């Protein structure tokens, strides 16, 4: 009951998915072969971890997940990796020619050749569900598959599953770890076409994750492996409420009620702490007050922006580990006296708190230190519009000269889709300003 299906699209979506499911398995005691000794109900069950894992008669715990990429090299590493026995072969779907960082090829030319098979494989996952809650879609903004095929999939999922909830984990492009120049185009195109079909989207700025890995984990030149292990921890904090249960546990859907005041304003700002190396965590216990204070340090945000220059519409705190309300309330009271936390005048100012007692895990050989307690803040702030502004401005610079547009037109798109998508973004930026204005 309350199953969630994860869909990982393109390289970034697939590789981040690999990190998430590895971490999930460790948190739940699932082995690389899908066996879970602690699970005494074989072949089924209604436990909390069954929201993300199905069970076969042979005791294998199978992710409720589909991996999709338009070329095979990234998913092949799953087919032959350590957790290869975790997935049935039909959960891993590949073409042979990718979208070449072209939204048009991912949404049209190449994507239309595989979209039917993908939906068929998702249906088979849905049919195993007794009360499907929704989908979690992982993808980059910048890739041609992550952008173009994701939009196509989201549009098709609205048709096949009505308004069943669809959440995104979206990788916002950063030049430090990208070798593509047309990513601003793909980002605006996919954001425009997906905006109506997504109920809530957590953007992850690769530059923010890049900086956190360098500053807090002392990694000289972070790789995707480094970024993804950190991203998996935030994703885990966000989905922990669905996979574990407890008296103080608050369901993610209940947080969403507070985070989305209007359908289009559905982009929460995530902030995670503590990110600390083993060398610094040694003889170092970070308290509830210390990790909570870290949530309001902008350097720990998942998206580069300044919330001090915006207004809050919601503040949620998702704790996990050794945390009790008494200390949370004390920490919050302290922060309210020392921080620039301004709410819009039409929204209450209380912070919404959930606690999952299961402590966080770390993957062996990683750089993150294992801690007794962590926290993910989910805030709805107008400051996240700064991320749209930076991306829209790069879009405008290239589109004024029509740079690279021929690649998209050559695959069937029209200039009208570019201007139509950019106008939708301009209205979104406008929407974020309007919500921050004081009432009459």
């Amino acid at each position: 009951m309350r199953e969630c299906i994860s869909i990982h699209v393109g390289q970034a979506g697939v590789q981040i998915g690999n990190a998430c499911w590895e971490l999930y398995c460790l948190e739940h005691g699932i082995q690389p072969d899908g066996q879970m000794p602690s699970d005494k109900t074989i072949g089924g069950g209604d436990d909390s971890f069954n929201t993300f894992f199905s069970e076969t008669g042979a005791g294998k715990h199978v992710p409720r997940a589909v991996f999709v990429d338009l070329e095979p090299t990234v998913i092949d590493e799953v087919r032959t990796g350590t957790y290869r026995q975790l997935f049935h072969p039909e959960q891993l779907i590949t073409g042979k020619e990718d979208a070449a960082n072209n939204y048009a090829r991912g949404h049209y030319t190449i994507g239309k050749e595989i979209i039917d098979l993908v939906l068929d494989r998702i249906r088979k996952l849905a049919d195993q569900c007794t009360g499907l809650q929704g989908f979690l879609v992982f993808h980059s903004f910048g890739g041609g598959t992550g952008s173009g095929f994701t939009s196509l999939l989201m549009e098709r999922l609205s048709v096949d599953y009505g308004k069943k909830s669809k959440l995104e984990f979206s990788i916002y492009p950063a030049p430090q770890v990208s070798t593509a120049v047309v990513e601003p185009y793909n980002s605006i195109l996919t954001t425009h076409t997906t905006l109506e079909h997504s109920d809530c989207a957590f953007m992850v700025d690769n530059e923010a994750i890049y900086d956190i890995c360098r500053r807090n984990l002392d990694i000289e030149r972070p790789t995707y492996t480094n970024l993804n292990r950190l991203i998996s921890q935030i994703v885990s904090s966000i989905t922990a409420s669905l996979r574990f249960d407890g008296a103080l546990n608050v369901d993610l859907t209940e947080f969403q009620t507070n985070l989305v005041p209007y359908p289009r304003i559905h982009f929460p700002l995530a902030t995670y702490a503590p990110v600390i190396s083993a060398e610094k965590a040694y003889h170092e216990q970070l308290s509830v007050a210390e990790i909570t204070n870290a949530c309001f340090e902008p350097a720990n945000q998942m998206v580069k922006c300044d919330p001090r220059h915006g207004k809050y519409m919601a503040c949620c705190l998702l704790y996990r580990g050794d945390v009790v309300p008494k200390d949370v309330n004390a920490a919050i009271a302290t922060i309210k006296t020392k921080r620039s936390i301004q709410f819009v005048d039409w929204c209450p100012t209380g912070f919404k708190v959930g606690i999952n007692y299961q402590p966080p895990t770390v993957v062996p050989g990683g750089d993150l230190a294992k801690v007794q307690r962590a926290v993910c803040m989910l805030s709805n702030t107008t400051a996240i519009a700064e991320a749209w502004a930076r991306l829209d401005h790069k879009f405008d610079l290239m589109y004024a000269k029509r740079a690279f547009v021929h690649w998209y037109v050559g695959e069937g798109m029209e200039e009208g889709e570019f201007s139509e998508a950019r106008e939708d973004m301009a209205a979104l930026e406008k929407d974020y300003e309007e919500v921050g204005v004081d009432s009459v």
Partner: protein, 422 residues
């Protein structure tokens, strides 16, 4: 998985083509018999891109050797690695082109083009997923320039959704005394502007100047010029051969379909008489290290790709690439954000611990086309040597069309050089 089909046409095309296969065969651990005897599995991971796995686990270049004379191709079969090439992939005639573009594009080459396509189809149909084609040729000759551009136009008819790349050798008075080379080059550029996705401008003027001024060779040979071409082609194809496809790479380098002519660069370039990451970066942005006789500081960069090879600090590479950009910001167009991208491959070339290969889409390339146009108009306004071409059936208009199309290419490069963000 992602196969490339290589073609080499004419004397030059076959010469540098053979050198290319010599160099990459060595890098992948393939001997002149086609057998693998390397020492790392990274050499075989993407060997399918350029080689077919044959019976007996021998690797055969996916290469097609073309010429209207058997002379050069006979040397290939006799030279080193002459036996790895598939014998049926030799498509030669006896007529010859006489350094006449018309003979290669229209007369002698048209009679042979069908037999060349027969080999292209048999190679292509054996590909799990064909990326596209790369052609090696010169633009001053007759076969490589005339029949090469014809092969491109006819391959595009059967494979219109595949990338077409060329390594085109531009003519220079410093290397060949033949007089009609500006005609053959201008007629070829007219074709390449329309039917290729990427063209590396391998400028003989720049190759000679490097061998003479830098490498200190009083009398550079074609072998000396080709050692530069071999090292360049190895560099630009490194990311394809060792662990993105031709299309993704063209997407990030070609902002406008006609402006797909690249300035190649390489570092280090040192003589036999007598290296840091900062020095590598500084050198590859120096005009002296460009394989095209153009000064990048006389124009602006639309896009740049740079690949470093060898064991080095990625952090230091990141710092120095940001360093050279900020100190040369004026030479990078503002309206294409983040237009300089960098890649690293742990496997260095032969005989070097570290190297860097530079791929620049610079408006300064107009200097190269301006030079060809000047030589062209200096002969066409007199109508000199035109009977070689009208004799094959061409009309003066086709010379006037090719001329004004290249002059348009120049003015198009100048347009975006002068464009600003605000």
């Amino acid at each position: 998985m992602r196969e490339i089909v290589h073609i080499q046409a004419g004397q030059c095309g076959n010469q540098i083509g053979a050198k290319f296969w010599e160099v990459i065969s060595d890098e992948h651990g393939i001997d002149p018999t086609g057998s693998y005897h390397g020492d790392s599995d990274l050499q075989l991971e993407r060997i399918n891109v350029y080689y077919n796995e044959a019976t007996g686990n021998k690797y055969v270049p996916r290469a097609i050797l073309v010429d209207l004379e058997p002379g050069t191709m006979d040397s290939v079969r006799s030279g080193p690695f002459g036996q790895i090439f598939r014998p049926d992939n030799f498509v030669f005639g006896q007529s010859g082109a006489g350094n006449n573009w018309a003979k290669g594009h229209y007369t002698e080459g048209a009679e042979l083009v069908d037999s060349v396509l027969d080999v292209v189809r048999k190679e292509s149909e054996s590909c799990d997923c064909l990326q596209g084609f790369q052609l090696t040729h010169s633009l001053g000759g007759g076969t490589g320039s005339g029949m090469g551009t014809l092969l491109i136009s006819k391959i595009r008819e059967e494979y219109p959704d595949r990338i077409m790349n060329t390594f085109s050798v531009m003519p220079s008075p410093k290397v060949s005394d033949t007089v009609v080379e500006p005609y053959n080059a201008t007629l070829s550029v007219h074709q390449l502007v329309e039917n290729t996705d990427e063209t590396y401008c391998i400028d003989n003027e720049a190759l000679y100047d490097i061998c003479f001024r830098t490498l200190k060779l009083t009398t550079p040979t074609y072998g000396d010029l080709n050692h530069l071409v071999s090292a360049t082609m190895s560099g630009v194809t490194t990311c394809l051969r060792f662990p993105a496809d031709l299309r993704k790479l063209a997407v990030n380098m070609v902002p406008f379909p006609r402006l797909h002519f690249f300035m190649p660069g390489f570092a280090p370039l040192t003589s036999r008489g007598s290296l840091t990451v900062p020095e590598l970066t500084q050198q590859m942005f120096d005009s002296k290290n460009m394989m095209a006789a153009c000064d990048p500081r006389h124009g602006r960069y639309l896009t740049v790709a740079a690949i470093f090879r060898g064991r080095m600090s990625m952090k230091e590479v990141d710092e120095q690439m940001l360093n050279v950009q900020n100190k040369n910001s004026s030479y990078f167009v503002e309206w294409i954000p983040n237009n300089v991208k960098t890649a690293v491959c742990d496997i260095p070339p032969r005989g070097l611990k570290m190297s860097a290969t530079f791929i620049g889409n610079s408006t300064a390339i107009q200097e190269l086309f301006k030079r060809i146009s000047e030589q062209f108009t200096a002969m066409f306004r007199r109508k000199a040597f035109l009977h070689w071409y009208t004799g094959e059936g061409m009309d003066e208009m086709e010379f006037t069309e090719a001329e004004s199309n290249m002059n348009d290419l120049v003015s198009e490069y100048q347009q975006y050089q002068d464009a600003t963000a605000d």
